[PDB]
Amino acid sequence: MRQLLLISDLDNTWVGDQQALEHLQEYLGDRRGNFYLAYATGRSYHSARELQKQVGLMEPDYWLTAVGSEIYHPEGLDQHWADYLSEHWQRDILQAIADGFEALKPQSPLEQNPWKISYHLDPQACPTVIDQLTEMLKETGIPVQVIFSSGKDVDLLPQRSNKGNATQYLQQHLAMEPSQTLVCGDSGNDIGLFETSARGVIVRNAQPELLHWYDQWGDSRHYRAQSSHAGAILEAIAHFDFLS
Ligand SMILES: [Mg+2]
Numbered sequence: 001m002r003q004l005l006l007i008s009d010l011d012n013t014w015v016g017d018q019q020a021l022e023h024l025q026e027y028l029g030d031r032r033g034n035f036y037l038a039y040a041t042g043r044s045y046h047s048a049r050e051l052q053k054q055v056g057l058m059e060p061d062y063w064l065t066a067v068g069s070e071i072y073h074p075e076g077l078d079q080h081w082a083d084y085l086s087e088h089w090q091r092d093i094l095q096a097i098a099d100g101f102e103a104l105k106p107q108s109p110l111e112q113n114p115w116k117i118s119y120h121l122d123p124q125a126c127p128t129v130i131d132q133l134t135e136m137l138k139e140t141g142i143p144v145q146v147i148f149s150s151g152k153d154v155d156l157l158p159q160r161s162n163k164g165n166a167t168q169y170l171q172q173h174l175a176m177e178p179s180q181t182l183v184c185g186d187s188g189n190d191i192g193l194f195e196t197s198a199r200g201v202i203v204r205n206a207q208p209e210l211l212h213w214y215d216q217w218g219d220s221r222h223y224r225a226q227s228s229h230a231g232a233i234l235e236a237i238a239h240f241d242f243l244s
Pocket residue numbers: 009010011012013186187
């Protein structure tokens with residue numbers, strides 16, 4: 001219903017260069033009705049809101065949060081995405097099984113949601129505990145994925161849940177064409193975004209994992225910005241002739 005669907009990662013992409021962030025937001029603010037804006041972050045909705053207060057993030061149309069587990073718009077959680085993630089999802093039994101692992105301790109309630117069961121691995125425990133949990137869960141027909149990061153954090157999420165999938169869902173939901181979509185990212189975790197049928201911008205400060213993906217699979221739709229952080233988004237908007 002608008003000219004552009006702008007989907008951007010937050011940390012180290014939209015955020016990182018405060019001056020550039022302000023320049024980008026002032027520009028977009030004067031043409032607000034011409035594009036849909038979605039922040040796609042690994043942060044929980046609450047954490048994303050805290051970052052908004054921290055750096056003054058402009059209000060987006062959508063928030064793709066918590067490893068794609070929850071999509072929010074100003075009036076609430078998107079129910080179609082929720083139903084999609086709920087299909088064959090069994091949070092109670094998964095939580096009950098994971099709770100049984102002495103080496104796993106539940107993360108704060110702030111990090112939990114209907115489609116995300118999170119834990120902390122005991123620093124004195126062995127990662128094989130995660131192998132055991134993962135193998136056990138694969139012995140079931142439950143579409144769950146186990147994500148172990150930083151050698152301490154454990155997320156149990158629907159297999160359907162991730163940033164790229166949430167982005168693809170949003171794109172079709174809003175009926176926006178690939179040529180009208182622009183994804184922005186910096187890390188290996190943003191590769192899913194770039195697998196979206198859309199134009200994309202890789203910020204200059206991108207992590208090697210994303211750069212290696214770009215060098216091998218990137219095509220005409222993927223712009224290697226000269227500028228870093230938010231500056232790369234302004235650069236890409238001009239490059240792809242958006243909002244002109
Ligand atoms: Mg990032």
